[PDB]
Design an enzyme around this catalytic site. Structure first.
Site, PDB file in Angstrom:
ATOM      1  N   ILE A 117     -32.477 -17.353  -8.245  1.00  9.75           N
ATOM      2  CA  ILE A 117     -31.431 -17.084  -9.226  1.00  9.75           C
ATOM      3  C   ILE A 117     -30.078 -16.744  -8.594  1.00  9.75           C
ATOM      4  O   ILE A 117     -29.051 -17.290  -8.995  1.00  9.75           O
ATOM      5  CB  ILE A 117     -31.857 -15.978 -10.218  1.00  9.75           C
ATOM      6  CG1 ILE A 117     -33.029 -16.466 -11.071  1.00  9.75           C
ATOM      7  CG2 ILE A 117     -30.691 -15.575 -11.107  1.00  9.75           C
ATOM      8  CD1 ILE A 117     -33.436 -15.505 -12.170  1.00  9.75           C
ATOM      9  N   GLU A 122     -27.753 -13.790  -5.612  1.00  9.30           N
ATOM     10  CA  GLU A 122     -27.651 -12.698  -4.650  1.00  9.30           C
ATOM     11  C   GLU A 122     -26.585 -11.692  -5.077  1.00  9.30           C
ATOM     12  O   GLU A 122     -26.879 -10.708  -5.755  1.00  9.30           O
ATOM     13  CB  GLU A 122     -27.309 -13.245  -3.262  1.00  9.30           C
ATOM     14  CG  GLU A 122     -28.421 -14.048  -2.607  1.00  9.30           C
ATOM     15  CD  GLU A 122     -27.899 -14.994  -1.543  1.00  9.30           C
ATOM     16  OE1 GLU A 122     -26.945 -15.748  -1.835  1.00  9.30           O
ATOM     17  OE2 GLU A 122     -28.437 -14.983  -0.415  1.00  9.30           O
ATOM     18  N   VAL A 182     -31.989 -10.284  -2.866  1.00 12.47           N
ATOM     19  CA  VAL A 182     -32.173 -11.640  -3.375  1.00 12.47           C
ATOM     20  C   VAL A 182     -32.983 -11.621  -4.671  1.00 12.47           C
ATOM     21  O   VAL A 182     -33.912 -10.827  -4.814  1.00 12.47           O
ATOM     22  CB  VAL A 182     -32.883 -12.531  -2.336  1.00 12.47           C
ATOM     23  CG1 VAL A 182     -32.764 -13.998  -2.719  1.00 12.47           C
ATOM     24  CG2 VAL A 182     -32.297 -12.295  -0.953  1.00 12.47           C
ATOM     25  N   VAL A 183     -32.631 -12.496  -5.612  1.00 10.38           N
ATOM     26  CA  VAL A 183     -33.268 -12.514  -6.929  1.00 10.38           C
ATOM     27  C   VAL A 183     -33.998 -13.829  -7.222  1.00 10.38           C
ATOM     28  O   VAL A 183     -33.462 -14.911  -6.986  1.00 10.38           O
ATOM     29  CB  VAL A 183     -32.241 -12.244  -8.053  1.00 10.38           C
ATOM     30  CG1 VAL A 183     -32.935 -12.150  -9.405  1.00 10.38           C
ATOM     31  CG2 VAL A 183     -31.461 -10.971  -7.766  1.00 10.38           C
ATOM     32  N   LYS A 211     -36.432  -8.684  -7.553  1.00 10.46           N
ATOM     33  CA  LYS A 211     -35.300  -8.324  -6.699  1.00 10.46           C
ATOM     34  C   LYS A 211     -35.787  -7.720  -5.382  1.00 10.46           C
ATOM     35  O   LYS A 211     -36.327  -6.616  -5.359  1.00 10.46           O
ATOM     36  CB  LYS A 211     -34.384  -7.342  -7.433  1.00 10.46           C
ATOM     37  CG  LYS A 211     -33.191  -6.840  -6.632  1.00 10.46           C
ATOM     38  CD  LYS A 211     -32.272  -6.011  -7.521  1.00 10.46           C
ATOM     39  CE  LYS A 211     -31.178  -5.321  -6.729  1.00 10.46           C
ATOM     40  NZ  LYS A 211     -30.293  -4.514  -7.615  1.00 10.46           N
ATOM     41  N   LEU A 258     -34.324 -12.335 -18.748  1.00  7.95           N
ATOM     42  CA  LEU A 258     -33.402 -12.713 -19.814  1.00  7.95           C
ATOM     43  C   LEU A 258     -32.783 -14.095 -19.568  1.00  7.95           C
ATOM     44  O   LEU A 258     -32.764 -14.594 -18.440  1.00  7.95           O
ATOM     45  CB  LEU A 258     -32.334 -11.635 -20.025  1.00  7.95           C
ATOM     46  CG  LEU A 258     -32.859 -10.391 -20.748  1.00  7.95           C
ATOM     47  CD1 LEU A 258     -31.925  -9.205 -20.578  1.00  7.95           C
ATOM     48  CD2 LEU A 258     -33.081 -10.686 -22.227  1.00  7.95           C
ATOM     49  N   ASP A 266     -19.400   0.011 -13.079  1.00  9.88           N
ATOM     50  CA  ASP A 266     -19.259  -1.401 -12.699  1.00  9.88           C
ATOM     51  C   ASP A 266     -19.442  -2.369 -13.875  1.00  9.88           C
ATOM     52  O   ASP A 266     -20.101  -3.402 -13.744  1.00  9.88           O
ATOM     53  CB  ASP A 266     -20.223  -1.756 -11.556  1.00  9.88           C
ATOM     54  CG  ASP A 266     -19.783  -2.991 -10.771  1.00  9.88           C
ATOM     55  OD1 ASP A 266     -18.583  -3.343 -10.820  1.00  9.88           O
ATOM     56  OD2 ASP A 266     -20.639  -3.604 -10.097  1.00  9.88           O
ATOM     57  N   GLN A 300     -20.307 -10.278 -15.788  1.00  8.79           N
ATOM     58  CA  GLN A 300     -21.377 -10.803 -14.945  1.00  8.79           C
ATOM     59  C   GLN A 300     -22.605  -9.894 -14.924  1.00  8.79           C
ATOM     60  O   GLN A 300     -23.703 -10.327 -14.571  1.00  8.79           O
ATOM     61  CB  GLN A 300     -20.876 -11.040 -13.517  1.00  8.79           C
ATOM     62  CG  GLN A 300     -19.719 -12.030 -13.403  1.00  8.79           C
ATOM     63  CD  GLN A 300     -18.354 -11.376 -13.561  1.00  8.79           C
ATOM     64  OE1 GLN A 300     -18.192 -10.410 -14.305  1.00  8.79           O
ATOM     65  NE2 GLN A 300     -17.364 -11.903 -12.848  1.00  8.79           N
ATOM     66  N   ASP A 351     -27.716  -3.914 -13.817  1.00  6.99           N
ATOM     67  CA  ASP A 351     -27.229  -3.601 -12.468  1.00  6.99           C
ATOM     68  C   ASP A 351     -26.670  -2.185 -12.333  1.00  6.99           C
ATOM     69  O   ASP A 351     -25.463  -1.969 -12.456  1.00  6.99           O
ATOM     70  CB  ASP A 351     -26.196  -4.633 -11.999  1.00  6.99           C
ATOM     71  CG  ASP A 351     -26.130  -4.745 -10.484  1.00  6.99           C
ATOM     72  OD1 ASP A 351     -26.549  -3.793  -9.790  1.00  6.99           O
ATOM     73  OD2 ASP A 351     -25.662  -5.789  -9.986  1.00  6.99           O
TER      74      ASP A 351
HETATM   75  C1  LIG Z   1     -26.373  -9.421 -11.170  1.00  7.21           C
HETATM   76  N1  LIG Z   1     -27.614  -9.362 -10.447  1.00  7.21           N
HETATM   77  C2  LIG Z   1     -28.864  -9.521 -11.124  1.00  7.21           C
HETATM   78  N2  LIG Z   1     -30.114  -9.085 -10.635  1.00  7.21           N
HETATM   79  C3  LIG Z   1     -31.203  -9.406 -11.591  1.00  7.21           C
HETATM   80  C4  LIG Z   1     -32.640  -9.070 -11.350  1.00  7.21           C
HETATM   81  C5  LIG Z   1     -30.664 -10.077 -12.740  1.00  7.21           C
HETATM   82  C6  LIG Z   1     -31.400 -10.572 -13.942  1.00  7.21           C
HETATM   83  N3  LIG Z   1     -31.344 -11.880 -14.248  1.00  7.21           N
HETATM   84  C7  LIG Z   1     -31.968 -12.372 -15.323  1.00  7.21           C
HETATM   85  N4  LIG Z   1     -31.920 -13.761 -15.658  1.00  7.21           N
HETATM   86  C8  LIG Z   1     -30.916 -14.684 -15.231  1.00  7.21           C
HETATM   87  C9  LIG Z   1     -29.657 -14.266 -14.827  1.00  7.21           C
HETATM   88  C10 LIG Z   1     -28.706 -15.187 -14.418  1.00  7.21           C
HETATM   89  C11 LIG Z   1     -29.010 -16.540 -14.418  1.00  7.21           C
HETATM   90  C12 LIG Z   1     -30.265 -16.978 -14.843  1.00  7.21           C
HETATM   91  C13 LIG Z   1     -30.641 -18.423 -14.857  1.00  7.21           C
HETATM   92  O1  LIG Z   1     -31.560 -18.784 -14.136  1.00  7.21           O
HETATM   93  N5  LIG Z   1     -29.995 -19.407 -15.670  1.00  7.21           N
HETATM   94  C14 LIG Z   1     -28.971 -19.043 -16.489  1.00  7.21           C
HETATM   95  C15 LIG Z   1     -28.395 -20.237 -17.175  1.00  7.21           C
HETATM   96  O2  LIG Z   1     -29.438 -20.994 -17.822  1.00  7.21           O
HETATM   97  C16 LIG Z   1     -30.438 -21.425 -16.869  1.00  7.21           C
HETATM   98  C17 LIG Z   1     -30.465 -20.680 -15.567  1.00  7.21           C
HETATM   99  C18 LIG Z   1     -31.209 -16.045 -15.236  1.00  7.21           C
HETATM  100  N6  LIG Z   1     -32.674 -11.568 -16.128  1.00  7.21           N
HETATM  101  C19 LIG Z   1     -32.771 -10.255 -15.890  1.00  7.21           C
HETATM  102  C20 LIG Z   1     -32.125  -9.713 -14.781  1.00  7.21           C
HETATM  103  C21 LIG Z   1     -32.232  -8.250 -14.518  1.00  7.21           C
HETATM  104  N7  LIG Z   1     -32.319  -7.134 -14.318  1.00  7.21           N
HETATM  105  S1  LIG Z   1     -29.065 -10.226 -12.566  1.00  7.21           S
END
Ligand SMILES: CNc1nc(C)c(-c2nc(Nc3cccc(C(=O)N4CCOCC4)c3)ncc2C#N)s1
Lengths: 254, 293
Positions: B11, B13, B16-17, B32, B82, B126, B130, B144
């Site tokens: 996903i 950095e 790493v996610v 994470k 999400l 923060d 984003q 975050d």
């Molecule tokens: C800002 N740093 C983050 N750490 C975590 C663990 C995050 C997080 N992310 C998601 N899901 C997510 C976030 C961003 C992008 C996609 C993604 O793969 N796509 C988006 C567009 O459509 C297809 C692809 C997914 N959910 C929960 C968390 C948390 N905590 S963000």
């Protein structure tokens, strides 16, 4: 603002969940109350050398009493538990924490760096990462708003700090109760006033309810110059705290 | 440990996610990864704060932490998954714009999440598009907590290097000795206007430029609107004197009630700046609903 009532209620809820076992020392085969007093007095000196906050000191003591409520420890490894607890409390509360190498130094070549780093990770596991605990210090800063004598404040933190030394008998009182007795006692010594009406309405504590706690603390003040531990008395001699450790205690309180 | 999880894709950095799947139950999650400094400084202080504070907060508008997995050299944080973050959603709506009832809905839920935080003595520090996540149903949650902190009553002097520049508060830019919950409110104010006008409100490219972009819009402050402003550690008498301008040109689509709320979230004096609890009662939210994106 409009949050300080919501916060005070929440803190009264969490101090019950973060409380140690009252009779844990009886079940520790190799350590005593006398040894614990020596460790705390040394931690006080460390806070002065590196100039740390008074809140950081209160947090470290809380971590230690919870760890020893769950795990058996020999007298030779007692200092190692204290060093790692003071390090974790620094990372949580301080803006500029001291580096690991300096925590190795003040133990005077007793332990290695690899040992300190491993004890850090074990303490986190035992406490399950629950570190945001209420202290005697946190309740005192709220009580201070109901006055504004700066000398009464210094003497109030002096009495509260003395309680950290003796497990018997202060391990049976809640932080909010300890704060209440320390405040009224300092107020009656300096000016001659008493536990304010406003605080009775806020805390729900009356002067009658604080009586058993207050009589214990009164005796600690009188016998202080002959206690085997002396690091706290000399700290509050400094003019930064208005030399409050030189004043004479009252003889009665009615 | 990790034998039950199967990775799908990366996903981004912190650490790493990844996006992953539970082999036995079928649940989809977000992992994470954080590396420990075994020979140097140990467990990072940012990780210690994020985990201990997130375990206390449980609310429909705050992301949920499911588990923490220990290893001799690594830590793994397990979150709920999400669908998307707000920044990416705003780019996809560049041509048409975001419907007004949806703007009203999103903002309402964000204020409910922040009120819970401050009631439990926690600062975020923060808040930006984003770090805000949405689903396919109409919900939005805060995320975050790597820069968060627990405060006291009254406050002390804390860390001065905080908040992303475009969303930073004026009292911080002037080097104040004390700050508090008012800085989180200011960030949500800039976010409100960005949803409306389809672009950032104060996109400065330096610390001094950032300060002036605010002055040209809200007007240069004096001791009448902000008592004690000339005693700030970074105040200077050589500051140019610009005049305030009309909110009818700042945010044209917004009506009467919306413009009333915006100007209270952007007040100069932090004492007079509106709180999240009091903002939930403003006339703007009289007819709030819950649309689907
Ligand atoms: C800002 N740093 C983050 N750490 C975590 C663990 C995050 C997080 N992310 C998601 N899901 C997510 C976030 C961003 C992008 C996609 C993604 O793969 N796509 C988006 C567009 O459509 C297809 C692809 C997914 N959910 C929960 C968390 C948390 N905590 S963000």
């Amino acid at each position: 603002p409009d949050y300080h009532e919501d916060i005070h209620t929440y803190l009264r809820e969490m101090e019950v969940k973060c409380k140690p076992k009252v009779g844990y020392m009886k079940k520790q085969p190799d350590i005593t109350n006398s040894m614990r007093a020596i460790l705390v007095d040394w931690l006080v000196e460390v806070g002065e050398e590196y100039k740390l906050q008074n809140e950081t000191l209160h947090l470290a003591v809380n971590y230690i009493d919870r760890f020893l409520s769950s795990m058996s420890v020999l007298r030779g490894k007692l200092q190692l538990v204290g060093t790692a607890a003071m390090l974790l409390a620094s990372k949580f509360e301080e803006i500029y924490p001291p580096e690991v190498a300096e925590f190795v130094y003040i133990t005077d070549d007793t332990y290695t760096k690899k040992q300190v780093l491993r004890m850090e990770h074990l303490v986190l596991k035992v406490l399950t990462f629950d570190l945001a605990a209420p202290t005697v210090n946190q309740f005192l800063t709220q009580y201070f708003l109901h006055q504004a004598n700066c000398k009464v404040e210094s003497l109030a933190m002096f009495l509260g700090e003395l309680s950290l030394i003796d497990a018997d008998p202060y391990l049976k009182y809640l932080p909010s109760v300890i704060a209440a007795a320390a405040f009224h006692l300092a107020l009656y010594t300096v000016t001659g006033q008493s536990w304010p009406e406003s605080l009775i309405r806020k805390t729900g504590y009356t002067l009658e309810s604080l009586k058993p706690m207050l009589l214990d603390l009164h005796q600690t003040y009188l016998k202080a110059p002959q206690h085997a531990q002396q690091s706290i008395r000399e700290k509050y001699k400094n003019s930064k705290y208005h030399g409050v450790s030189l004043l004479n205690p009252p003889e009665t309180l009615n | 440990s990790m034998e039950n999880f199967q990775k799908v894709e990366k996903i981004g950095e912190y650490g790493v996610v990844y996006k992953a799947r539970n082999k036995l139950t079928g649940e989809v999650v977000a992992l994470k990864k954080i590396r420990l400094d075994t020979e140097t400084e140990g467990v990072p202080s940012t990780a210690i704060r994020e985990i201990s504070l997130l375990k206390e907060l449980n609310h429909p508008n705050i992301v949920k932490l499911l588990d923490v997995i220990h290893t001799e050299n690594k830590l793994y944080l397990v979150f709920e998954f999400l669908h998307q973050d707000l920044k990416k959603f705003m780019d996809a709506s560049a041509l048409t714009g975001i419907p007004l009832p949806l703007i009203k809905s999103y903002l309402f839920q964000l204020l409910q999440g922040l009120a819970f935080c401050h009631s439990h003595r926690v600062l975020h520090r923060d808040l930006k598009p984003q770090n805000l996540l949405i689903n396919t149903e109409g919900a939005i949650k805060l995320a975050d907590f790597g820069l968060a902190r627990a405060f006291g009553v009254p406050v002390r002097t804390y860390t001065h290097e905080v908040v992303t520049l475009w969303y930073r508060a004026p009292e911080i830019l002037l080097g104040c000795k004390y700050y508090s919950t008012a800085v989180d409110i200011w960030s949500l104010g800039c976010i409100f206007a960005e949803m409306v006008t389809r672009r950032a409100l104060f996109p400065g490219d330096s610390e001094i430029d950032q300060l002036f972009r605010i002055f040209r819009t809200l007007g240069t402050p004096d001791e009448v609107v902000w008592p004690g402003v000339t005693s700030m550690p970074d105040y200077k008498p050589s500051f140019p004197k610009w005049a305030r301008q009309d909110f009818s040109k700042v945010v044209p689509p917004l009506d009467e009630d919306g413009r009333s709320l915006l100007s209270q979230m952007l007040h100069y004096d932090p004492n007079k700046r509106i709180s999240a609890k009091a903002a939930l009662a403003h006339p703007f939210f009289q007819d709030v609903t819950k649309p689907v994106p």
